[PDB]
């Protein structure tokens, strides 16, 4: 399953460097776009993001495992697009930053797995029609 593995590698790498603050083919191009658009979405939606973060009340590892419920519940609500997919990964980065401050850095890798799982399981067909990560790069090109 190339699509699950590829998506996990991109989401995990970006979530790691958003918490650490230290950066590290098709995947190479996708991370460049994700840094540019992701950090953009985080600024434009800080009021909504901090409001959701305080409502969730993430203090330990148990809370991180229960996030998959809310994830599926709100991500599946309406119609999907590249922007909503970017908001999913951007808020995922906004939570990973909170996990660094509360000394729960060990919960960054499983959160990235849970995010990839929801994305691929609910939207595989949409992602395939849209040309996967090649499509993601071409969509946000400026």
């Amino acid at each position, epitope marked *: 399953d190339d699509l699950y593995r590829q998506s996990l590698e991109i989401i995990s790498r970006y979530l790691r460097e958003q918490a650490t603050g230290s950066k590290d*083919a*098709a995947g190479r*191009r996708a991370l460049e776009t994700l840094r540019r658009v992701g950090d953009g979405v985080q600024r434009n939606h800080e009021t909504a993001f901090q409001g959701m973060l305080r409502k969730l009340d993430i203090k330990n590892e148990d809370d991180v495992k229960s996030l998959s419920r809310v994830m599926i519940h709100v991500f599946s609500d309406g119609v999907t697009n590249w922007g909503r997919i970017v908001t999913l990964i951007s808020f995922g980065a906004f939570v990973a930053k909170h996990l660094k401050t509360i000394n729960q850095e060990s919960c960054i890798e499983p959160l990235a797995e849970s995010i990839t799982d929801v994305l691929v399981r609910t939207k595989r067909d949409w992602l395939v029609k849209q*040309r996967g990560w*090649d499509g993601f*790069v*071409e969509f946000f*090109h400026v």
Partner: single-chain antibody
Amino acid sequence: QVTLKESGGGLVKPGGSLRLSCAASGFTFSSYSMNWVRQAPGKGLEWVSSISSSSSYIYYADSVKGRFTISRDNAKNSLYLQMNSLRAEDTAVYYCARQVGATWAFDIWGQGTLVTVSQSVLTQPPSASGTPGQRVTISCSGSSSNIGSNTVNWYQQLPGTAPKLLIYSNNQRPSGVPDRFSGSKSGTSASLAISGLQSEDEADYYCAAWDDSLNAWVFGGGTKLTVLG
């Protein structure tokens, strides 16, 4: 100066082989999907193949599967068409075209190259006519898997010229297209409107959309528009 320029066309015997090249200038080539589109002499547009930016997503029309091979070299800004087992039916002018990531419209087209070897899924009326100032409408009929699931694009083709993007995303006009031109979509049909005819409007008009069942681009058969009196 954002341009595309085709090379390789020539006379070939049936069953022969020929290789096409397309050189891109003025843009980040590594960040765009690329297409081949052919036009038999005195006939309509026909999509051939497409390749994504990283070469991961490749598609072909049924009439070329197994004989034609699309490839790209981002380090040389080049797109290729490797054509084996060439048939009389393959005689056409082959166009190189750039596709927009956010819309799938073909915004930049090359001048074409003649390859000489020696029924469309979207229906349009074969002709339309009017007088200066008149409002004329051109229709485009498809089905659930194409127009019913995807956006419609329109292309203008002036006599002895390459096609150009007229309308994208059903009703959006690119920069340089007069507001006389407008579009609409309803169910599995679409329409092109010219509110106030001008003599430079005399041309051929084609619609196009992606098909989810065929995994292919389907073009309309075209409409020859004449400006009278």
